[PDB]
XYZ file of C-alpha atoms in Angstrom:
398
model
C 65.882 -5.834 -42.536
C 62.391 -5.865 -43.817
C 60.332 -5.119 -40.436
C 61.483 -5.402 -36.601
C 62.283 -8.566 -34.541
C 59.189 -9.091 -33.128
C 59.800 -11.518 -30.700
C 58.179 -9.782 -27.866
C 55.009 -9.614 -29.788
C 54.598 -13.275 -30.901
C 53.643 -15.530 -27.797
C 54.141 -18.988 -28.249
C 53.925 -22.778 -26.649
C 55.947 -25.535 -27.568
C 55.954 -29.007 -27.268
C 57.859 -32.114 -28.685
C 56.796 -35.267 -29.873
C 58.680 -38.332 -30.624
C 57.852 -39.892 -33.951
C 58.835 -43.191 -35.628
C 59.925 -46.813 -34.254
C 60.933 -45.885 -30.744
C 57.766 -43.707 -30.118
C 56.110 -46.554 -27.754
C 60.107 -46.271 -25.570
C 60.358 -42.712 -25.624
C 63.467 -43.019 -27.881
C 63.779 -41.391 -31.291
C 65.016 -44.443 -33.323
C 67.297 -42.433 -35.986
C 67.227 -45.834 -38.070
C 63.423 -46.120 -38.077
C 61.254 -43.194 -38.999
C 62.863 -41.532 -36.073
C 62.381 -38.037 -36.230
C 61.522 -35.404 -33.005
C 58.472 -33.432 -33.838
C 58.487 -29.688 -32.737
C 54.857 -28.303 -32.210
C 54.195 -24.389 -31.503
C 50.848 -22.812 -30.681
C 51.338 -18.722 -31.240
C 49.377 -15.993 -30.986
C 50.417 -12.247 -32.723
C 49.505 -9.064 -31.606
C 47.825 -6.354 -33.536
C 50.627 -4.309 -34.003
C 52.916 -6.631 -35.530
C 53.183 -5.573 -39.683
C 54.326 -7.057 -43.056
C 58.224 -7.554 -42.778
C 58.014 -7.964 -39.191
C 59.893 -11.494 -37.876
C 59.993 -13.834 -35.282
C 62.868 -16.607 -35.008
C 63.439 -19.772 -33.480
C 66.629 -20.424 -32.057
C 66.870 -24.575 -32.655
C 70.306 -24.480 -30.048
C 73.272 -26.845 -29.687
C 71.649 -30.313 -30.735
C 69.457 -30.111 -33.179
C 68.608 -28.653 -36.623
C 65.347 -28.225 -38.444
C 65.010 -31.229 -41.169
C 65.785 -34.743 -41.546
C 68.522 -35.890 -43.698
C 68.633 -33.537 -46.959
C 70.969 -30.756 -46.133
C 71.495 -27.841 -46.786
C 68.249 -27.379 -44.231
C 64.927 -25.496 -44.828
C 61.914 -24.617 -43.234
C 58.581 -24.196 -44.534
C 56.200 -20.981 -44.408
C 53.741 -21.043 -41.899
C 49.951 -20.999 -42.864
C 46.342 -19.961 -41.343
C 43.635 -23.024 -41.625
C 42.686 -21.973 -44.763
C 46.207 -22.500 -46.263
C 47.019 -18.201 -46.239
C 50.678 -17.741 -45.604
C 50.917 -15.755 -42.089
C 54.629 -15.836 -42.408
C 57.870 -16.732 -44.486
C 60.211 -18.944 -42.987
C 63.850 -19.082 -43.826
C 66.657 -20.424 -42.321
C 70.578 -19.524 -41.316
C 72.566 -22.797 -40.773
C 75.670 -20.578 -39.171
C 73.279 -19.569 -35.888
C 70.929 -22.519 -36.346
C 68.018 -20.456 -36.409
C 64.820 -19.707 -38.348
C 63.418 -16.595 -39.182
C 59.588 -16.002 -39.762
C 58.780 -12.772 -41.771
C 54.973 -11.825 -41.599
C 53.424 -11.132 -44.711
C 50.516 -8.433 -45.292
C 48.485 -11.543 -43.316
C 48.979 -9.098 -40.621
C 47.662 -6.132 -42.060
C 44.514 -7.689 -43.601
C 43.685 -9.893 -40.276
C 43.638 -8.820 -36.822
C 43.794 -11.388 -33.785
C 45.939 -13.169 -35.909
C 47.141 -17.117 -34.439
C 47.968 -20.586 -35.668
C 50.111 -23.267 -34.684
C 53.071 -24.990 -36.885
C 55.297 -27.789 -36.497
C 59.175 -28.485 -37.584
C 60.728 -32.176 -38.320
C 63.810 -32.036 -36.254
C 67.086 -34.398 -36.362
C 70.041 -34.440 -33.927
C 73.488 -33.223 -35.261
C 75.214 -36.775 -35.279
C 78.801 -35.304 -34.356
C 77.275 -34.422 -30.973
C 74.324 -36.806 -30.689
C 77.222 -39.593 -31.050
C 76.042 -42.639 -29.239
C 72.826 -44.826 -28.766
C 70.633 -43.953 -25.429
C 72.106 -40.747 -25.288
C 69.686 -37.966 -23.626
C 70.687 -34.784 -24.374
C 69.209 -31.323 -23.575
C 67.006 -30.467 -26.445
C 66.932 -26.680 -25.632
C 65.578 -24.174 -28.082
C 64.629 -20.513 -27.983
C 60.884 -19.927 -29.604
C 60.203 -16.295 -30.212
C 62.526 -15.593 -27.362
C 60.974 -17.915 -24.706
C 63.354 -20.901 -23.860
C 61.954 -24.644 -24.175
C 64.031 -27.448 -23.212
C 62.937 -31.101 -22.601
C 65.739 -34.454 -22.548
C 65.199 -36.328 -25.787
C 66.895 -40.000 -25.874
C 68.120 -41.083 -29.371
C 69.008 -44.357 -30.592
C 70.877 -45.244 -33.900
C 70.816 -48.730 -33.338
C 74.414 -49.920 -34.104
C 74.729 -53.108 -33.215
C 77.794 -55.127 -33.222
C 77.675 -57.237 -36.262
C 79.490 -58.315 -39.622
C 77.897 -55.378 -41.439
C 75.825 -52.043 -40.432
C 75.246 -49.171 -42.913
C 73.257 -45.880 -42.638
C 72.711 -42.613 -44.748
C 74.615 -39.974 -43.063
C 72.924 -37.125 -44.999
C 72.002 -36.590 -48.138
C 72.679 -33.435 -51.087
C 71.399 -32.788 -54.364
C 73.949 -34.277 -55.661
C 74.914 -37.205 -53.733
C 74.328 -39.227 -50.476
C 77.050 -39.956 -47.793
C 76.739 -43.377 -46.539
C 78.502 -45.239 -44.064
C 79.139 -48.690 -43.647
C 80.811 -50.479 -40.593
C 82.228 -53.779 -40.896
C 83.277 -56.442 -38.573
C 82.463 -54.807 -35.516
C 82.321 -58.020 -33.622
C 85.976 -58.832 -34.918
C 85.370 -61.963 -35.615
C 88.156 -63.742 -37.899
C 87.420 -63.132 -41.693
C 89.438 -63.796 -45.130
C 88.626 -62.573 -48.265
C 86.564 -59.821 -47.288
C 84.460 -58.140 -49.972
C 81.985 -55.533 -49.482
C 79.545 -54.284 -52.151
C 77.618 -50.895 -52.403
C 74.523 -50.521 -54.356
C 71.973 -48.253 -54.719
C 68.027 -47.311 -56.220
C 68.214 -43.975 -56.830
C 71.893 -43.707 -56.515
C 75.298 -44.685 -58.746
C 78.814 -44.567 -58.196
C 81.369 -43.168 -61.009
C 84.774 -43.331 -59.792
C 86.576 -45.050 -57.144
C 87.582 -41.565 -55.572
C 83.648 -41.199 -54.477
C 85.113 -44.224 -51.766
C 86.886 -44.210 -48.657
C 87.927 -46.790 -46.363
C 89.334 -46.702 -42.913
C 90.897 -49.787 -40.624
C 89.719 -48.623 -36.787
C 92.780 -49.013 -34.028
C 89.961 -49.784 -31.776
C 86.143 -49.949 -31.444
C 85.512 -46.458 -29.669
C 85.831 -45.119 -33.869
C 82.886 -47.227 -34.631
C 80.625 -44.399 -33.909
C 77.039 -44.966 -32.869
C 75.665 -42.301 -35.289
C 77.294 -43.612 -38.131
C 79.551 -39.781 -38.669
C 82.819 -41.057 -37.781
C 85.586 -38.787 -36.809
C 87.414 -39.482 -39.755
C 90.031 -36.789 -39.315
C 91.519 -39.125 -36.702
C 91.240 -42.182 -38.830
C 93.813 -42.519 -41.673
C 92.517 -43.655 -45.079
C 93.805 -47.056 -46.272
C 96.067 -45.175 -48.988
C 95.712 -47.399 -52.189
C 92.474 -49.139 -51.271
C 91.354 -51.621 -53.985
C 87.873 -50.451 -55.413
C 86.376 -51.349 -58.689
C 83.206 -49.588 -59.871
C 80.972 -52.244 -61.925
C 78.847 -51.717 -64.904
C 75.765 -52.218 -62.932
C 77.042 -48.720 -61.070
C 77.394 -50.570 -57.737
C 81.515 -50.507 -56.258
C 82.893 -53.510 -54.916
C 85.800 -52.764 -52.422
C 88.174 -55.879 -51.508
C 89.650 -55.484 -48.110
C 91.084 -58.636 -48.201
C 92.188 -61.124 -45.447
C 91.683 -58.720 -42.818
C 91.691 -61.371 -39.481
C 89.981 -59.521 -37.086
C 90.162 -55.736 -38.155
C 87.511 -53.585 -38.448
C 86.815 -51.258 -41.171
C 84.810 -48.234 -41.909
C 83.685 -47.493 -45.420
C 82.821 -43.563 -46.276
C 81.138 -43.736 -49.744
C 79.457 -40.679 -51.582
C 76.881 -42.394 -54.319
C 75.295 -40.242 -56.764
C 71.736 -39.200 -56.674
C 70.052 -40.285 -60.242
C 68.908 -37.423 -62.383
C 64.773 -38.210 -62.901
C 64.922 -40.434 -59.421
C 61.366 -39.962 -57.985
C 60.673 -42.586 -55.482
C 61.919 -44.559 -52.551
C 65.809 -44.846 -52.969
C 67.879 -47.251 -51.203
C 71.433 -47.936 -50.329
C 72.650 -51.501 -49.472
C 76.117 -53.008 -48.373
C 76.757 -56.606 -48.863
C 79.869 -57.778 -47.013
C 80.977 -61.319 -48.240
C 83.688 -63.336 -46.219
C 85.200 -66.212 -45.103
C 85.402 -67.251 -41.482
C 87.828 -69.706 -39.099
C 85.953 -72.540 -40.775
C 86.561 -71.945 -44.245
C 83.047 -71.291 -44.404
C 82.202 -68.133 -46.597
C 78.635 -66.264 -46.982
C 77.484 -62.877 -47.565
C 75.152 -60.493 -45.310
C 73.788 -57.435 -46.304
C 72.265 -54.410 -44.785
C 70.239 -51.872 -46.891
C 68.707 -48.610 -45.649
C 65.878 -46.957 -47.565
C 65.121 -42.850 -47.941
C 62.505 -40.858 -50.009
C 63.300 -38.341 -52.754
C 62.443 -36.511 -55.807
C 66.016 -35.133 -57.249
C 64.390 -32.468 -59.172
C 62.900 -31.510 -56.098
C 65.860 -32.290 -53.823
C 67.462 -28.918 -53.230
C 64.101 -27.783 -51.898
C 64.153 -24.415 -53.463
C 64.420 -22.266 -56.666
C 63.946 -19.207 -58.992
C 62.464 -17.464 -61.316
C 62.331 -14.421 -63.576
C 61.153 -12.459 -66.482
C 60.849 -8.997 -68.715
C 58.230 -6.776 -68.944
C 57.599 -4.220 -71.962
C 55.403 -2.000 -73.517
C 54.377 -3.959 -76.877
C 60.573 -0.493 -75.066
C 61.307 -2.286 -71.846
C 58.919 -1.428 -69.107
C 61.299 0.229 -66.187
C 60.267 -0.120 -62.391
C 57.103 -1.861 -62.758
C 55.861 -3.228 -59.755
C 55.878 -7.338 -59.600
C 54.470 -8.893 -56.481
C 55.448 -12.543 -55.393
C 51.874 -13.944 -54.029
C 50.964 -17.706 -52.254
C 47.875 -19.654 -54.557
C 45.551 -17.448 -52.018
C 46.543 -14.025 -53.070
C 48.782 -13.026 -49.955
C 51.939 -11.153 -50.906
C 55.068 -13.107 -49.925
C 57.466 -10.746 -51.587
C 57.897 -7.471 -53.907
C 60.642 -6.346 -56.260
C 60.406 -3.904 -59.552
C 61.574 -4.372 -62.810
C 65.193 -2.836 -63.245
C 65.974 -0.548 -66.271
C 66.278 -3.279 -68.754
C 62.904 -4.496 -67.940
C 64.129 -7.425 -65.761
C 62.747 -8.735 -62.651
C 63.581 -11.918 -60.226
C 62.698 -13.724 -57.238
C 65.329 -16.124 -55.625
C 65.586 -18.567 -53.048
C 61.528 -19.404 -53.055
C 60.664 -22.714 -51.681
C 59.731 -25.301 -53.824
C 55.827 -24.932 -54.817
C 52.854 -23.228 -56.324
C 52.651 -19.291 -56.765
C 51.122 -16.566 -58.320
C 53.293 -13.741 -60.046
C 51.385 -10.119 -59.875
C 52.259 -7.317 -62.454
C 50.679 -4.335 -61.369
C 49.603 -2.276 -64.903
C 50.441 1.540 -64.697
C 47.150 3.101 -65.222
C 45.274 2.593 -68.530
C 47.893 -0.378 -69.255
C 46.620 -4.339 -69.451
C 48.809 -7.311 -70.579
C 48.693 -8.501 -74.742
C 47.038 -11.030 -76.114
C 50.247 -21.480 -66.475
C 52.641 -18.638 -67.113
C 49.736 -16.506 -68.579
C 49.260 -13.283 -67.523
C 45.270 -13.431 -66.735
C 43.299 -11.269 -64.815
C 41.700 -13.014 -61.964
C 40.412 -11.619 -58.531
C 40.989 -8.056 -59.373
C 45.133 -8.399 -60.314
C 47.009 -9.470 -63.643
C 48.443 -12.643 -62.474
C 50.629 -15.273 -64.080
C 50.846 -19.093 -62.278
C 54.621 -20.467 -61.676
C 55.229 -23.349 -60.291
C 58.955 -23.925 -58.640
C 61.294 -26.369 -58.446
C 65.294 -26.473 -57.817
C 65.733 -25.668 -61.600
C 64.667 -24.769 -65.275
C 61.481 -23.355 -63.618
C 59.187 -21.116 -66.433
C 60.222 -17.624 -67.434
C 57.215 -15.255 -66.628
C 57.211 -11.893 -68.962
C 54.388 -9.655 -69.683
C 53.890 -6.997 -72.560
C 51.804 -4.486 -71.758
C 49.514 -2.182 -74.173
C 46.859 0.682 -73.659
C 43.715 -0.486 -72.656
């Protein structure tokens, strides 16, 4: 522990705001920009010090973030962008921790606000128009409001949604023939922008026993659906996939697919289901549904790390290295080990300063260059998921 739990010294007032296509109707429209925004205004007792922390427990029904998992929380800042506290999230306890920086040692009368976007757990908020008691605990005080969620699961030939996204793939859910019309020669093409298929293994096919299984949240209980054992799936040359369901009659199907994120993709991704079928009067047609999702693959994990070496220009052991925000607030500290190496891991993607604390009478040798700025020797580093710059420092007598 860097400090103590100071929930009793952080005084927070909370409200919710519904965003997206259902705001006028007081509903979170999960497939129309719907999110639940949590807005927190707080004050902090002057006795709080660097390393102390407060918590936000998201309770039973929601998590911070939206589609990309694992979920994360951002740092919290003052009006000038100075970091007041570092945000971390623990998935097992669905709780965020906000750990105060040296901001609280530089300033008194610490106060601020911040907001979080949040989404429901789709396995608990399962049903369109479900009103759930969204109870959270903010710095040790409960706040609850009932919130209505709606996924717009229409009883139609084809509808699909993105269940979740990870750095490597999305899980895409396609519902076929919920209207239970008589259909023959049923084929489904799954296609994307920013995504591709490589193997039939990325696609699972399920026949529903009854309509109860078409869960509105598009996160079905697959453990209670038996896969079609040998589905007919072809991976096309364009990276799409075609599933031949055959003469399904009035049966309903769910297709659970895991299209891969494309390296280098940056933009508004799309996942689309096209369902081609023939009806009871021998008319063949194609219906389609598409869902959009903004992402940058290089930043999709949302965090990364970096390190480097310090030496006398002999490894320099036990040199203090601080991680600062661009305004000079201390976010973390470490020391070089016996080999002269240091590192910082699990850093939210963004820009940082790396401060090397000079031993008396030493200066660096000679972006990643260690320069004298605002009384400190610092390099600049930009953190993304992977391939971050190594940040080294050679030291010489002044």
